[PDB]
């Protein structure tokens, strides 16, 4: 009858509960993503996120980069992916420095300097390893023929 | 109860107020103290709802002003017919439409300007005109200048009648507001009467007059031997010679055997091979079927006889679980606000003009129009511009509605209320869509320019490289090409050859041929999508943030049109919805400019040209669109620089007016930037020094000179910008197309 | 469960369980039955639409090379496409199980419409009934169409083409 | 409840081109630069609301409210000097007569002679 | 005591939680529709109404609109994240446009605007001409 | 915060106070003019700098002057 209502039953907050923001699908997905999932160490959040991203990042470089038509095109795509991961890791590092300062963190929450450093390291490892795994997978594509 | 309510002798007829400039405005009525007054007088002249708080009076003023506009339009049409009757080579063009250039304007010999009277053929000198008058007149069956003279006389009579009707319905018999609020009856009459009877009567003219005259004219009969139009009415044997089913008469119509009329009511499709235009029998069948449809549509709404629909009921019923009260309140809005109606109607009329431009190029409706490349270009471009302006105006008047006629009490939890309640989501998502479209669509071109400059053609987005094929458009093109036998089995040919098929050749020139779509077409269509989305972003932001925003919470109290709310809050210049119209106008200019450039280059490169009897096709620009239009350098070199040759080399010929107008339009466009880039504080300070010089010689106006207002500075800058840019494209197109036609 | 459920009970037949396959089933079992009825119905509706499109010749993918016969196009599709289809549905199913664990979950309600509306509302029950009945019809229709394509050889319309 | 709580911010007024902290303070004493959203079970900043099973919208949960009693009490506290001035010019018990007879807001709104008129009644 | 409002995307943001928030209360004598400054229409309740807003200017725009309803008892507060409140408007119980005894003039300069000193006369002092 | 100054040419017309969108200004008693009141700006922390007060002021030259200075959240009119 009414699929839109104010978020948190608060008419004056700038948000609405719609199927996009508040469906069971959206809630289950978002609560299960490693950026939000209960119980993960910051390092493991970073690792899972890096694993997810580095795997797909190699594709654009491998298939569309300048050396795509050479026989070392996959290797160049992997190198480009590693360079992109380094750029992103620099972004994460300076972000953490700005957002949290340089004082010793008093807690283990992700939004703290020490936890963010752990998360950034996990992201770097996950992304680089995932790019390497995708390189291996793209080295031999199965046709799936018996 | 639908009734006519009129007040008699509403307003005296007198010249007193003609002597009291600004009488309509309480503030402006006191007379001028500064030159600003003068400008204000013109700005507020037709702003009727600010001149009075009575809706009935606004309605009466609008009705009479509409009659005035109709009188002006009739005067314009009558003038065109008179120039065809006395200053044209129409008679000569009738005998040989292919080699004689249409001309309906002649200039007097003075200061050497007579060079503009081109050697257009037919023992006639004048200006080559591109509005399509000769093609339309030939399609109507007009064969003599005397018929044109009579059409012009009738146009004058109708212009006078409209003017008297406007005076009568303002000063003598002014309808009451209850009369105007008759949406149901107005729709019934305008559908069944205006559109339905108009279509039926035009089909009557086409069946009885235009069809046999054009059949004779195509068959090679001289215009001076074709029977006069009334002979076809008084001689059923004359029609039976041409269309044999006329020997049966109206017996099949009332008997129901309508198939008998298949000889003059056809479904051929394609184009007439002799003329290069649509078959007149198809057009007559089209108008007859449309007349029937409109007459049916005009019985939908209830007026006085119990049966029919109430619009408010229909609107109130359409609501769902996502939309609260849905369409409730819309009927009250559209029967109490002239601005809401004007917003809708301008949006529709502009979109319709754009549609007209497309459909008239691809399915050329008049004989010998398709191979008159100058006329085709000018008609497409003109209707594109008209449509762009009208859609922007619809947006502007939507904003005016939001500021002035929107009431919160009448719009609780309806569609309008909920749109206002998620404006932030709407505008943020549209902003993102605009960035995505702009980055990708224009980055294609930038990538291509960089790759070509670096000597890396194989890395470009192109047909010969990384391809971006518009596969959906191609799929649709194939479907339309296959339609004539299968999904439209009674159609003998395709609706338009642009979708596929043979080349239609008239006088050795190509009328229409399939327009193939590749990577360059993909890129340009996404540029069009980008520009339209940005224009919509600006205008929709102007409508949705017209009343308020996080920056200025009380914008509605500042009005529709105000320069700013001061330099505070970081600066609030151009926060008004009028300023959103101002910026949207620039973006519409950008969009339409790109659309008409795409049309011009694509048609010259891939459609228009010559065709030898053997079959060899030679296009105007040699098919360079595919590889040249994929970079900005290719547009700058192969389109602008190359095709500007005619306009810049026109001095000393009949086209020299185009070179002059090209230059003058550049000048006015650059002149606009003074207004757009500056501010009135500087100019007022300069005027102080100039007023000093006048005072130093004992004279100065009591109407103190003032720099233009902020909003007038913007308006003037934009008006000169549009005039300059559009006029430049106008001169360029006309010189180019007159050369290539 | 029979005195609690209202969705799916509709005109002609009212409550329809002649075989008595619902008597003596616990609430979890009947929730499974409703979730299965809905999932089979939704899959069958999607299958019917896809089959009709393919049979009509509107299958423009792969340069429209695949056969108009859907059961032939099933085998002409490479293995990797089916692997993607199965794994993508599997991921969706995993998320659906996560949704199913949630309290107050209504069997078959992946969207979680219970956050906004319940069966005390007439129109929502009616629209749920429309979904359910069309699902039942589409389950029968997909089985029948598969029969007609396999044993009768014809993969198109055999009911309304004979009219026109 | 302290009245200068707003003024006790970290805004250090510049020596020129700066109106400083006026009647209530130039800015909030709370540092607005806080962390973004946080995983399930964690808080982004000190007083942040626990978004429960939806921490991504945690910032849409309100931890700042104005209950009517606090409103009345801060109304009285912030206008105590204006009421003191009005009794000083009209002239403890008299103020309690006036502010209960007609109201506190009305006592602020009236005039010293008008209150001299309403004090005529008892 | 919230008015009848279905919500919008125009309401307050994280700042209301971490920097400052505003509240306006008022008394209506009937249920009447009004325009939310954040976009859309809300229904006032018979009796006391309370509304939260991101900016003081929004509260004052709403109060200006309330004046057209003949409602003059509105009060405007600022609320900090700790829960401390500041009573903002009308500051002394009397509207600022109506002169009130007990107010002291702030920021007056006892001369016409044309008597401010010359900039070159206060160079390197750190002051401006309008503050000296 | 912006600076708002009142000069002694003020005639106590109360128009700047009514124009102010953020309640920066108020009328206070004063014996310098016929109306017996002068404008005051005790709450410049809430001044956005719109200059509506200056637009409303009838004297020549202005009696209320807004000089823009150090920007804050309040002076920038930010809802975020
Ligand atoms: C903006 C439009 C645009 C596009 C689409 C391209 C595309 C390309 N450029 Mg070009 N280029 C451009 C503008 C563009 N360029 C501009 C403005 C310049 C400067 C003048 C250049 C200068 C340039 C040079 C010098 C070169 C290129 C090259 C390339 C190619 C490789 C690039 C690459 O690997 O990136 C990697 C891409 C990514 C890492 C990510 C792409 C974005 C992802 C796919 C978006 C995914 C979003 C997802 C769908 C959202 C939802 C997902 C889900 C979670 C829900 C590629 C074809 C290279 C080439 O050799 O061309 C053949 C090359 O050497 N470009
Ligand atoms: C539809 C609009 C229209 C337009 C743009 C034109 C344009 C033209 N006509 Mg055509 N014409 C038209 C309709 C039009 N006509 C109609 C309806 C008729 C039938 C009457 C004609 C019959 C006609 C003839 C017979 C001729 C033209 C000619 C011309 C050309 C020269 C005009 C000229 O300079 O006269 C002279 C211009 C003036 C004297 C300017 C006077 C302007 C007045 C004083 C200002 C009016 C302002 C305001 C209304 C008055 C306020 C003050 C007042 C109350 C005192 C020019 C291209 C001539 C031509 O083509 O030569 C080859 C020519 O011979 N026209
Ligand atoms: C400033 C406004 C403006 C100007 C100066 C022009 C100028 C021109 N128009 Mg254009 N036109 C405009 C706006 C304008 N148009 C708009 C907004 C539309 C969209 C409706 C059109 C649609 C249009 C069509 C379909 C045609 C023209 C044609 C022409 C040319 C011949 C003039 C003529 O008398 O034909 C007279 C017009 C006809 C003989 C055909 C009219 C057929 C339409 C469908 C009639 C619609 C009338 C209907 C009652 C309007 C209500 C719409 C409804 C939804 C409510 C001339 C260049 C004609 C042309 O190019 O000839 C070579 C032509 O065929 N125009
Ligand atoms: C079937 C009868 C009929 C016809 C033919 C029209 C036609 C028109 N009306 Mg409508 N009108 C009608 C019934 C009709 N009306 C009724 C019953 C009402 C009351 C509900 C209205 C209330 C109304 C209003 C408020 C307005 C109109 C307007 C118009 C004009 C619209 C602009 C246009 O596209 O003109 C195309 C131009 C032509 C078709 C040229 C021919 C014009 C003549 C006069 C048509 C009549 C000839 C016919 C033989 C009689 C058009 C002339 C608008 C207007 O412009 O008024 C001045 C306008 O503002 N009408
Ligand atoms: C059906 C068409 C239509 C109608 C009836 C109206 C009616 C109105 N408009 Mg709207 N509008 C329209 C279309 C329309 N408009 C379109 C298409 C646009 C987009 C451009 C707009 C954008 C718009 C804005 C931004 C505003 C209006 C406003 C108005 C109102 C005041 C009109 C006035 O006093 O101007 C008097 C008329 C003039 C001063 C003439 C101006 C001349 C123009 C600028 C240049 C003409 C160039 C000429 C053709 C070429 C000369 C070349 C030569 C010199 C070489 C009036 C209600 C105003 C308003 O406040 O509404 C309440 C307002 O601010 N309109
Ligand atoms: C050619 C000059 C020019 C350019 C480049 C722009 C660009 C833009 N305008 Mg502006 N505009 C212009 C003229 C221009 N405008 C003029 C003259 C006016 C006065 C009328 C305006 C008034 C105006 C308004 C009212 C609005 C815009 C908006 C926009 C943005 C549209 C969204 C978009 O597509 O972003 C994409 C960016 C581009 C298309 C530019 C280049 C993209 C490159 C080629 C690809 C990506 C490169 C990438 C960033 C890598 C960079 C490498 C670098 C680090 C070295 C875009 C940034 C709108 C907006 O902001 O919407 C969201 C908007 O509402 N403009
Ligand atoms: C969804 C409902 C549905 C509909 C409308 C049809 C329609 C049809 N069935 Mg089918 N049928 C269906 C499902 C359906 N079937 C199911 C679920 C089965 C069990 C597998 C069958 C088993 C079946 C057999 C054995 C035969 C039909 C046949 C037919 C056709 C002849 C009419 C008839 O038998 O009654 C007609 C096209 C006959 C046929 O195919 O004619 C060529 C036929 O021999 N049906
Ligand atoms: C291809 C054309 C342009 C496509 C743009 C984006 C493609 C994405 C698909 C969107 C189409 C379906 C929209 C929802 C389906 C739809 O048609 O309406 C479905 C639904 C209608 O709800 P009800 O059944 O309550 O409707 C009762 C009606 O009577 C309305 O009163 O609308 C909504 O749920 C809210 C609509 C906003 C939904 C926003 C979605 C994103 C919109 C994108 C912007 C649109 C651009 C068009 C502007 C003219
Ligand atoms: C009541 C619901 C309904 C469904 C669900 C349905 C489905 C299909 N119809 Mg049928 N159909 C009607 C109704 C329905 N049709 C009606 C009222 C008429 C009279 C106008 C009618 C006539 C024809 C003709 C002449 C053909 C036809 C076909 C298909 C085929 C391709 C679908 C597509 O792609 O559009 C799918 C199975 C074609 C065919 O069988 O090709 C081998 C074909 O040639 N239909
Ligand atoms: C994660 C992002 C993503 C990418 C980047 C991607 C890409 C491609 N998909 Mg996939 N897709 C999903 C996601 C993605 N797909 C998901 C979640 C599902 C389950 C709902 C799914 C289902 C199918 C099916 C049924 C088919 C299919 C195909 C292709 C193929 C087409 C080019 C080609 O292979 O010629 C390209 C590479 C077709 C195919 O592979 O045909 C042999 C095919 O039939 N997909
Ligand atoms: C140039 C310019 C001016 C100065 C231009 C002015 C004042 C226009 C002058 C118009 C004239 C006076 C009217 C037309 C008269 C002819 C130019 C000369 C004829 C003189 C008499 C017959 C009246 C502004 O005032 C302005 C304001 C805001 C933004 C930009 C600008 C801007 O760019
Ligand atoms: S006066 Fe001019 S510069 Fe100043 S805020 Fe207004 S529009 Fe902007």
Author numbering:
A (entry chain L): 2 to 147
B (entry chain A): 12 to 752
C (entry chain 3): 32 to 195
D (entry chain W): 47 to 137, 148 to 178
E (entry chain D): 8 to 139
F (entry chain C): 2 to 81
Lines from the paper:
The conversion of light energy takes place within two multi-subunit membrane protein complexes, known as photosystem I (PSI) and photosystem II (PSII), which perform light harvesting, charge separation, and electron transfer reactions. To optimize light energy capture, numerous light-harvesting antenna subunits are associated with the periphery of the PSI and PSII core complexes, transferring excitation energy to the respective photosystem cores. Diatoms possess unique LHCs known as fucoxanthin Chl a/c-binding proteins (FCPs), which differ in pigment composition and amino acid sequences from the LHCs of land plants. LHCs specific to PSI (LHCIs) bind to a eukaryotic PSI monomer, forming a PSI-LHCI supercomplex, the structures of which have been revealed by cryo-electron microscopy (cryo-EM) in various eukaryotes.
In this study, we solved the structure of the PSI-FCPI supercomplex from T. pseudonana CCMP1335 at a resolution of 2.30 Å by cryo-EM single-particle analysis. Based on this classification, the five FCPI subunits in the PSI-FCPI structure are identified using five genes: RedCAP, Lhcr3, Lhcq10, Lhcf10, and Lhcq8, corresponding to FCPI-1–5, respectively. The PSI core comprises 94 Chls a, 18 β-carotenes (BCRs), 1 zeaxanthin (ZXT), 3 [4Fe-4S] clusters, 2 phylloquinones, and 6 lipid molecules, whereas the 5 FCPI subunits include 45 Chls a, 7 Chls c, 2 BCRs, 15 fucoxanthins (Fxs), 7 diadinoxanthins (Ddxs), and 3 lipid molecules. The PSI core contains 12 subunits, 11 of which are identified as PsaA, PsaB, PsaC, PsaD, PsaE, PsaF, PsaI, PsaJ, PsaL, PsaM, and Psa29. Psa29 exhibits a unique structure distinct from the other PSI subunits in the T. pseudonana PSI-FCPI and engages in multiple interactions with PsaB, PsaC, PsaD, and PsaL at distances of 2.5–3.2 Å. FCPI-1 is positioned near PsaB, PsaI, and PsaL through protein–protein interactions with these subunits at both the stromal and lumenal sides. At the stromal side, I138 and S139 of FCPI-1 interact with K121, G122, and F125 of PsaL, whereas at the lumenal side, multiple interactions occur between I109 of FCPI-1 and F5 of PsaI, between T105/L106/T108 of FCPI-1 and W92/P94/F96 of PsaB, and between E102/W103 of FCPI-1 and S71/I73 of PsaL. The protein–protein interactions at the lumenal side appear to be caused by a loop structure of FCPI-1 from Q96 to T116 (pink in Figure 3D), which is unique to FCPI-1 but absent in the other four FCPI subunits (pink in Figure 3E).
